[PDB]
């Protein structure tokens, strides 16, 4: 399958080279996989989700995404037009309020919720969690992300937007999950992207067009936008039987575009998520 005039990030993850416009992907498109988007919620009614999105948990008064950030991330995972894994099942877990903030205790509860909730969903190709969030180092937040990964979920987390070593941020600094840096359309490290030894992978994170609330779209930038590329790519590869939740991050790193990125500090991986699609 070939989506012409795709958002640059989708094109990028199906190319060895920057500056292409076509997203090439296997038609299976993550069908049979589940991705939990642990965020501000998902506007499941957005036509771009084609009925494949549903809120499964909220830690606030409403499950509605009053912010947009969760809906954007969900759109990069699995919307029709903006998504890596266009046939994945999206499940919204609202751990962030409508300002995009959330207490650590709530984010941890939302991770533990996914680890349990996945057991009562039909996700035959496996389960992914996309955590486009983060704050300062917290051993308890990292432990929660480690548990969710251990439970058999491919956890992808944002490296953070501090232009600093991700070692000081959580859950970015949890070694066992897939910590995702951001790149731009020219294969530079996104100016804001965290870096460091704990990064597993980069994905497109600068000027990412996806779904927004009110049935809209917009382009925003962040390691929050890179993370769902990787989460969707994991869902896609798991559906293709190429990898499993336990190994997807390593598989994505192993199969990444290597050495393509500029402004990668020594000791940070130079790896850009790539689906290796061959028609
Ligand atoms: Ca290349
Ligand atoms: Ca709910
Ligand atoms: Ca709220
Ligand atoms: Ca972040
Ligand atoms: Ca890791």
Swiss-Prot record:
Binds 2 calcium ions per subunit. It comes from the Eukaryota. It is an enzyme of class 3 (hydrolase). Ca(2+) 2 binds at residues 16, 260. Its EC number is 3.4.21.64. Keywords: Calcium, Disulfide bond, Hydrolase, Metal-binding, Protease, Serine protease, Signal, Zymogen. Residues 7-279 form the Peptidase S8 domain. The active site is at 39 (charge relay system), 69 (charge relay system), 224 (charge relay system). Its cofactor is Ca(2+). Ca(2+) 1 binds at residues 175, 177, 200. One of its GO terms (cellular component) is extracellular region. GO terms for molecular function: metal ion binding; serine-type endopeptidase activity. Disulfide bonds join 34-123, 178-249. It catalyses: Hydrolysis of keratin, and of other proteins with subtilisin-like specificity. Hydrolyzes peptide amides. One of its GO terms (biological process) is proteolysis. Hydrolyzes keratin at aromatic and hydrophobic residues. Belongs to the peptidase S8 family. This is Proteinase K. The chain holds residues 106 to 384 of 384 of the full protein.
